[PDB]
Amino acid sequence: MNIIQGNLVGTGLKIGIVVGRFNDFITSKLLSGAEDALLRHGVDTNDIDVAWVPGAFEIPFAAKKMAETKKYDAIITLGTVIRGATTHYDYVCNEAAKGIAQAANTTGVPVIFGIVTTENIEQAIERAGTKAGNKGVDCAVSAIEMANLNRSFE
Amino acid sequence: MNIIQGNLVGTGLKIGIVVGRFNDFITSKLLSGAEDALLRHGVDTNDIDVAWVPGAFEIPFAAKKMAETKKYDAIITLGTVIRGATTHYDYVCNEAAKGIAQAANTTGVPVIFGIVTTENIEQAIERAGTKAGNKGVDCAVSAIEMANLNRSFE
Amino acid sequence: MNIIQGNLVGTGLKIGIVVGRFNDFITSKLLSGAEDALLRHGVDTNDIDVAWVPGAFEIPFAAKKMAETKKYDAIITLGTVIRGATTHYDYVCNEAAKGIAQAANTTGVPVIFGIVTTENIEQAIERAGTKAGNKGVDCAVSAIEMANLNRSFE
Amino acid sequence: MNIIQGNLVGTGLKIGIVVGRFNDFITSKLLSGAEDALLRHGVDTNDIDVAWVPGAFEIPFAAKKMAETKKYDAIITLGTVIRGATTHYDYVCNEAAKGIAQAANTTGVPVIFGIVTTENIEQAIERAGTKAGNKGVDCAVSAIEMANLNRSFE
Amino acid sequence: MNIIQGNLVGTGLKIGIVVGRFNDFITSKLLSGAEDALLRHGVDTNDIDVAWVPGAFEIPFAAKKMAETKKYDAIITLGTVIRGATTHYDYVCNEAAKGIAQAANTTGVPVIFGIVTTENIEQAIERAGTKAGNKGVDCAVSAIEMANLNRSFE
Numbered sequence: 057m058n059i060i061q062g063n064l065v066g067t068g069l070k071i072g073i074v075v076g077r078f079n080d081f082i083t084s085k086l087l088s089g090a091e092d093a094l095l096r097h098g099v100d101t102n103d104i105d106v107a108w109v110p111g112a113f114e115i116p117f118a119a120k121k122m123a124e125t126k127k128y129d130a131i132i133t134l135g136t137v138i139r140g141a142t143t144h145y146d147y148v149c150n151e152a153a154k155g156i157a158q159a160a161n162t163t164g165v166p167v168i169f170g171i172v173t174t175e176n177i178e179q180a181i182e183r184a185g186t187k188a189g190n191k192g193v194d195c196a197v198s199a200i201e202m203a204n205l206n207r208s209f210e
Numbered sequence: 211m212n213i214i215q216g217n218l219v220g221t222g223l224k225i226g227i228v229v230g231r232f233n234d235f236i237t238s239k240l241l242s243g244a245e246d247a248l249l250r251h252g253v254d255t256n257d258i259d260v261a262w263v264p265g266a267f268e269i270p271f272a273a274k275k276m277a278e279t280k281k282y283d284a285i286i287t288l289g290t291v292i293r294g295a296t297t298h299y300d301y302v303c304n305e306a307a308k309g310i311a312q313a314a315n316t317t318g319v320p321v322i323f324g325i326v327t328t329e330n331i332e333q334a335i336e337r338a339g340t341k342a343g344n345k346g347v348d349c350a351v352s353a354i355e356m357a358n359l360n361r362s363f364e
Numbered sequence: 365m366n367i368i369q370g371n372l373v374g375t376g377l378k379i380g381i382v383v384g385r386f387n388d389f390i391t392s393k394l395l396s397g398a399e400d401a402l403l404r405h406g407v408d409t410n411d412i413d414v415a416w417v418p419g420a421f422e423i424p425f426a427a428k429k430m431a432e433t434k435k436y437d438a439i440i441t442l443g444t445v446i447r448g449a450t451t452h453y454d455y456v457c458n459e460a461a462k463g464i465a466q467a468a469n470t471t472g473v474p475v476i477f478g479i480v481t482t483e484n485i486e487q488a489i490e491r492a493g494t495k496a497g498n499k500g501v502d503c504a505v506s507a508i509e510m511a512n513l514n515r516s517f518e
Numbered sequence: 519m520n521i522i523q524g525n526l527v528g529t530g531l532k533i534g535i536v537v538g539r540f541n542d543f544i545t546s547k548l549l550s551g552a553e554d555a556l557l558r559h560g561v562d563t564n565d566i567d568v569a570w571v572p573g574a575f576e577i578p579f580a581a582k583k584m585a586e587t588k589k590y591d592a593i594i595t596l597g598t599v600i601r602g603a604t605t606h607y608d609y610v611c612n613e614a615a616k617g618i619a620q621a622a623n624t625t626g627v628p629v630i631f632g633i634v635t636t637e638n639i640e641q642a643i644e645r646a647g648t649k650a651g652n653k654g655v656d657c658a659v660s661a662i663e664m665a666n667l668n669r670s671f672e
Numbered sequence: 673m674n675i676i677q678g679n680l681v682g683t684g685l686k687i688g689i690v691v692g693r694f695n696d697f698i699t700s701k702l703l704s705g706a707e708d709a710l711l712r713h714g715v716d717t718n719d720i721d722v723a724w725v726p727g728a729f730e731i732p733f734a735a736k737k738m739a740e741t742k743k744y745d746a747i748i749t750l751g752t753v754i755r756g757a758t759t760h761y762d763y764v765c766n767e768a769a770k771g772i773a774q775a776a777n778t779t780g781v782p783v784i785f786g787i788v789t790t791e792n793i794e795q796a797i798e799r800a801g802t803k804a805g806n807k808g809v810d811c812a813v814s815a816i817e818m819a820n821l822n823r824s825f826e
């Protein structure tokens with residue numbers, strides 16, 4: 057068989073990031089994690105644009121617009137939705153993931169899903185640079201991989 | 211990295227609001243909350259158009275049409291769906307959130323999701339100007355932010 | 365602010381109705397409820413077209429086609445899905461609500477969601493002209509409102 | 519009001535059927551049920567084309583393509599998804615129902631949802647020609663109705 | 673009635689495969705299973721292109737692009753999402769299944785859903801070449817069937 061991959065060399069890549077202000081206590085650590093990860097992989101700090109939106113529901117809207125400028129190789133979406141007392145959590149999470157997916161689809165640009173969806177604050181901290189690592193770092197790496205792999209497609 | 215934000219200066223913005231009549235006991239307080247929030251942020255009362263629809267299922271329909279007039283910088287959707295004895299709640303909430311999201315998508319205009327979805331009346335009052343604040347106020351602020359941030363995109 | 369509403373004057377309106385045969389014991393009472401409601405609001409009986417389909421899954425298909433004829437001001441969908449032993453209920457309800465919503469979306473014509481989704485026969489009778497009123501009547505009224513409000517949009 | 523129906527006269531109709539091989543122990547009885555039902559309603563055996571696909575996930579794909587040939591008055595989808603140990607069941611059922619619905623939508627041809635989704639083998643047998651009747655027969659009848667009703671629409 | 677099938681002769685077919693790196697402990701066995709299955713069915717190893725993506729959320733993106741090249745008769749998606757402590761599982765699985773389905777839809781090329789979604793590692797191993805067989809092998813076979821069946825459609 058013939059293998060098609062994407063290496064982790066970020067040199068020369070232009071990355072766009074959309075972060076939600078909601079739960080910034082967490083998302084900010086996600087953002088910084090992604091930044092460091094990108095830099096240590098060869099991406100130039102100036103080649104990184106970060107756009108802040110109120111909540112995760114907004115993330116798709118910004119992600120699509122940024123991707124449409126065709127100015128980026130990949131887009132990283134960073135958010136943190138923590139469940140509450142109502143089903144609000146459900147809609148925010150669904151629409152976010154739904155839109156983040158269709159953004160990449162209609163845009164052709166890889167849009168990495170980095171929205172942390174937990175039951176409580178602990179699980180959030182758990183995935184923002186603790187026990188489970190930093191989802192932001194994992195997303196940065198995936199962004200790089202997808203950008204490189206995307207060269208192999210047109 | 212390069213940051214892209216949206217400040218909270220509402221001066222000069224034109225806002226459209228779609229409110230559901232259903233559970234108006236709550237939604238009306240959401241509406242007034244949004245209005246006051248907008249005014250105190252610099253938005254002119256005359257630059258605010260409010261459209262009433264039966265229920266939340268209708269909100270998407272009106273939100274899309276209002277956004278399509280391209281007459282608004284952002285659109286705020288206000289509603290309150292309180293769970294009952296059947297799964298009706300589920301469809302109304304899903305379709306509302308689904309449509310409110312696609313309205314902004316297909317329209318390019320930010321459409322703020324301000325539909326309160328609770329298990330009971332108490333949680334509704336809780337989020338319409340009590341313990342948890344007023345979702346209407348939060349949406350007004352988000353509308354302003356998104357409108358301003360949207361300038362940075364084309 | 366500037367208010368945009370829809371009054372309950374049905375005079376001159378042309379209404380289309382799609383009813384599911386499934387659970388007709390209930391849906392028929394929903395239909396007659398809507399009819400009477402429409403008439404008593406000024407709609408002429410001859411300005412009302414009713415189309416019957418097997419079940420609620422079919423409702424969206426007929427609703428979209430009727431709306432596309434642009435012959436109607438609003439479309440009322442009437443159905444009753446009562447939960448059973450399997451998850452069948454789920455798909456029928458979701459697809460119905462999903463399609464009824466997109467019908468109005470793609471058609472520009474208001475399509476009122478009048479599908480009663482209950483756990484048992486009692487809750488169905490409850491919402492078809494008993495304790496909880498008649499969802500058909502509520503839909504007729506919403507249809508009229510949406511039709512009138514729709515004049516304010518193009 | 520003016521009633522629009524669909525009678526159960528299958529004479530002259532051309533029906534397409536898509537059956538999943540998965541759980542054929544059940545689906546085959548669904549298929550034969552639909553066949554007999556169609557024949558006894560006036561449909562000519564030669565006017566019936568049956569296409570087999572691996573599982574229910576594939577059904578939408580085949581149903582849309584068959585409908586697109588515009589060679590059929592209605593399309594019957596027959597499948598049986600029985601829940602297992604994982605959530606696999608969920609995705610297969612959702613995508614199936616989602617696609618079978620959009621097939622009719624985008625195609626204009628009625629596509630009858632005849633996918634049996636149960637918790638166990640017993641409920642499957644229950645709906646494939648036992649206690650609860652034969653969903654295949656019910657779908658055949660619905661297919662005929664929808665085909666005839668569809669004449670009333672363009 | 674007239675039957676339309678797809679035989680299991682892979683000779684001459686060109687297959688594309690998208691595998692997620694996430695849970696590669698399992699997915700790799702899925703991939704090898706698919707490969708062997710394809711070869712033993714007549715597919716030439718050189719007629720098989722494999723593309724690796726970070727996780728299942730990425731699978732749809734790659735599957736659509738590969739399908740769009742119109743260079744393949746069918747596309748096999750291979751992944752393994754194992755549930756964790758949060759609802760993350762839900763979004764990854766839904767979006768994956770959602771996208772893998774729409775890829776085939778919009779592309780016209782069959783895209784086989786081979787994403788293993790389990791509650792634990794054991795059920796994963798169970799479906800990757802143990803008690804329940806190898807989902808990769810089952811997908812390979814389905815890919816071949818769908819490719820052949822697809823000849824019958826335009």
Ligand SMILES: O=c1[nH]c(NC[C@H](O)[C@H](O)[C@H](O)CO)c([N+](=O)[O-])c(=O)[nH]1
Pocket residue numbers: 076077078079110111112113114135136137138139140144145148321322323324349352
């Ligand atoms: O990013 C998040 N947005 C949230 N807000 C929802 C949404 O993203 C918007 O802020 C607002 O709903 C209007 O669009 C959240 N909660 O409400 O809990 C959350 O946890 N995380």
Ligand SMILES: O=c1[nH]c(NC[C@H](O)[C@H](O)[C@H](O)CO)c([N+](=O)[O-])c(=O)[nH]1
Pocket residue numbers: 230232233264265266267268289290291292293294298299302475476477478503506
């Ligand atoms: O906005 C709401 N709409 C509701 N009605 C449903 C829907 O919004 C429409 O009014 C009507 O269904 C026709 O589409 C609600 N309930 O039914 O409970 C509710 O709580 N909130």
Ligand SMILES: O=c1[nH]c(NC[C@H](O)[C@H](O)[C@H](O)CO)c([N+](=O)[O-])c(=O)[nH]1
Pocket residue numbers: 384385386387418419420421422443444445446447448452453456629630631632657660
């Ligand atoms: O309108 C309904 N249709 C139902 N049938 C589902 C569907 O509407 C179609 O009749 C058939 O599925 C083929 O399209 C129902 N149940 O099955 O329970 C139900 O409760 N209500």
Ligand SMILES: O=c1[nH]c(NC[C@H](O)[C@H](O)[C@H](O)CO)c([N+](=O)[O-])c(=O)[nH]1
Pocket residue numbers: 538539540541572573574575576597598599600601602606607610783784785786811814
């Ligand atoms: O028709 C069915 N297909 C099933 N397979 C899923 C799918 O239809 C495809 O065969 C395969 O997933 C690759 O597309 C089923 N299960 O897995 O249980 C089932 O119960 N019924």
Ligand SMILES: O=c1[nH]c(NC[C@H](O)[C@H](O)[C@H](O)CO)c([N+](=O)[O-])c(=O)[nH]1
Pocket residue numbers: 167168169170195198692694695726727728729730751752753754755756760761764
């Ligand atoms: O294929 C998988 N991807 C997973 N990652 C999610 C997603 O596929 C992407 O890798 C990343 O979310 C950014 O798009 C998984 N988990 O997170 O558990 C998993 O179990 N399986």
